[PDB]
From a paper:
Chondroitin sulfate A is a linear, sulfated carbohydrate linked to periodontal disease as the principal species of glycosaminoglycan appended on the surface of cortical bone of teeth and in supporting dental ligaments. Through genomic comparisons with B. thetaiotaomicron, a new [name]-like operon (Bfo2285-Bfo2295, and Bfo3043) was identified in [name] and the crystal structure of two proteins from this [name]-like operon, Bfo2290 and [name], were reported using X-ray crystallography. Here we define a pathway for the degradation of CSA by [name] based on the discovery of a [name]-like gene cluster found using bioinformatics analysis, functionally characterize three proteins (Bfo2285, Bfo2290, Bfo2291, and [name]) from this [name]-like gene cluster and report the crystal structure of an exo-N-acetylgalactosamine (Bfo2290) and for a 2-keto-3-deoxy-6-phosphogluconate ([name]) and 2-keto-4-hydroxyglutarate (KHP) to D-glyceraldehyde-3-phosphate aldolase ([name]). As CSA is the primary GAG in alveolar bone, this likely serves as a mechanism by which [name] compromises periodontal tissues contributing to bone loss in periodontal disease in conjunction with host osteoclastic activity.
The structure of [name] was solved to a resolution of 2.20Å in the space group of P23 and iteratively built and refined to a corresponding Rwork of 0.179 and Rfree of 0.221. [name] was found to have an α/β-barrel structure and contained a glutamic acid and lysine zwitterionic-pair typical of class I aldolases which use a Schiff-base mechanism to convert [name] and KHP into D-glyceraldehyde-3-phosphate and pyruvate. Key residues highlighted in yellow Glu 49 and Lys 141 form a zwitterionic-pair critical to the catalytic function of [name]. KDP was modeled in orange as part of the co-crystal structure of a KDPGal aldolase to show the orientation of the substrate in the active site. Enzyme kinetic studies previously conducted by Eshaque et al. was successful in showing that [name] is a [name] aldolase. As the enzyme was found to be dependent on NADH as a cofactor, the enzyme kinetic constants of [name] were determined by quantifying the decrease in concentration of NADH by measuring the decrease in absorbance at 340nm as it was consumed in the reaction. Analysis of substrate specificity and pH optimization by Eshaque et al. also showed that the preferred substrate for [name] was CSA at pH 6.5. The assay was not repeated for [name], however through multiple sequence alignments and comparisons against structural homologs, [name] may also be capable of similarly degrading [name].
Residue numbers in the entry: 5 to 224
Write the structure that this text describes.
């Protein structure tokens, strides 16, 4: 359907896992979303990386209302404000990017749509917060590491961080990030082995998602 900022933040916080998938093929995207939904995933991020990716997103967005009615769909890899506006027109419930662009914050704030900008320093986290961003994306996480989140959260306990990059659906990796204070994690390649997609092994996608979500749940 369409979910307001309150539900999106809460659902992201509670599940703690945001799959990150390409906008390649509409039919492949539907299957990945179906497999993730069955695994318990309720927030899903499409990336704006292929040509006319917003057209794939629009098709999936209209289909997902009946197919996976509790899935909250959002867009990632956004670096400019007009493209963020375009996906808001297409039904995006949250906007994520690898960097921070204040113009995007302005356009997202105008519709109370959560903007999750990429941050790579404690100052960048703070400026994003000043812009009204409730969740900041620590990116790339493998570069900054769990210690970055732990160090930031001590003087800035209000901070809520999504970690993306270098997160794995393994218990030792997930424990490290959530013990450090992460609110949710984003994952792409590690949630969908390219082998499993190519052969249509969707139950494998469901299982990895379920297992990762289960580890997050007992960590919390």
């Amino acid at each position: 359907a369409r979910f307001d900022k309150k539900e999106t933040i809460r659902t992201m916080t509670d599940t703690g896992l945001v799959p990150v998938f390409c906008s390649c093929d509409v039919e492949v995207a539907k299957q990945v979303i179906r497999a993730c939904y069955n695994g318990g995933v309720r927030v899903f991020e499409f990336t704006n990386r292929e040509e006319a990716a917003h057209e794939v997103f629009g098709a999936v967005s209209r289909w997902i209302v009946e197919a996976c009615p509790e899935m909250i769909l959002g867009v990632g890899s956004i670096v400019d404000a007009p493209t963020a506006s375009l996906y808001l027109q297409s039904g995006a419930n949250f906007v994520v990017g690898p960097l921070t662009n204040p113009d995007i914050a302005k356009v997202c704030n105008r519709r109370l749509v959560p903007y999750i900008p990429g941050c790579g320093s404690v100052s960048e986290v703070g400026y994003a917060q000043e812009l009204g961003c409730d969740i900041c994306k620590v990116f790339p996480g493998d570069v900054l590491g769990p210690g970055f989140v732990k160090a930031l959260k001590a003087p800035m306990p209000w901070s809520q961080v999504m970690v993306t990059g270098g997160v794995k659906p393994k218990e030792a990796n997930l424990k490290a990030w959530f013990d450090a204070g992460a609110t949710c994690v984003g994952m792409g390649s590690n949630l969908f082995p390219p082998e499993a997609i190519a052969s249509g092994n969707w139950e494998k996608i469901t299982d990895i998602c379920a297992q990762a979500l289960g580890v997050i749940r007992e960590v919390r």
